[PDB]
């Protein structure tokens, strides 16, 4: 259900 | 079989008042889905990749390159983590130094 995704560091 | 080839990575921390920053962005965990991965070797693969690296920032002039899978960050594992786990593990506010094993190579 949870999609791949990215975050800012 | 797979040999991944691992190298090191120290990024100094920029910090800006109240704001830490590493200058670079992640993506996978083993709660997300790996099939999603646009870098990925194997679609399986549920590690911690650096999806940006930002002009002029920390990570850039450490070397840090989009792509890249973090192995390890200050001795701490980061192939079966969470996804906030692994930036948990990366925003440890008491730290300067952040030391990174990362692969962009497999051997062979």
Same mark, same amino acid.
């Given at each position: 259900?949870?999609?791949?995704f990215d975050?800012?560091? | 079989?797979?040999? %991944?080839?691992?190298?090191?990575?120290?990024?100094?921390?920029? =910090?800006?008042?109240?704001?830490? $920053?590493?200058?670079?962005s992640?993506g996978? &965990? $083993?709660?997300?889905? *790996?099939?999603?991965? *646009?870098?990925?070797?194997?679609?399986?693969?549920?590690? $911690?990749? +650096?999806t /940006?690296?930002?002009?002029? &920032?920390? %990570?850039?002039?450490?070397?840090?390159?989009?792509?890249?899978? $973090?192995?390890? +960050?200050? &001795?701490?594992?980061?192939?079966? +983590? !969470?996804?906030?786990? %692994? =930036?948990? /593990?990366? !925003?440890? /506010?008491?730290?300067?130094?952040? /030391?990174?094993?990362? !692969?962009?190579?497999?051997?062979?």
């Amino acid at each position: 259900q949870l999609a791949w995704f990215d975050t800012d560091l | 079989p797979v040999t %991944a080839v691992v190298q090191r990575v120290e990024i100094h921390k920029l =910090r800006q008042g109240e704001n830490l $920053i590493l200058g670079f962005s992640i993506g996978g &965990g $083993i709660d997300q889905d *790996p099939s999603q991965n *646009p870098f990925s070797e194997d679609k399986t693969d549920k590690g $911690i990749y +650096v999806t /940006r690296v930002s002009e002029g &920032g920390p %990570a850039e002039i450490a070397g840090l390159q989009i792509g890249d899978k $973090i192995m390890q +960050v200050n &001795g701490w594992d980061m192939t079966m +983590v !969470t996804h906030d786990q %692994a =930036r948990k /593990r990366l !925003t440890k /506010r008491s730290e300067e130094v952040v /030391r990174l094993l990362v !692969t962009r190579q497999s051997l062979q």
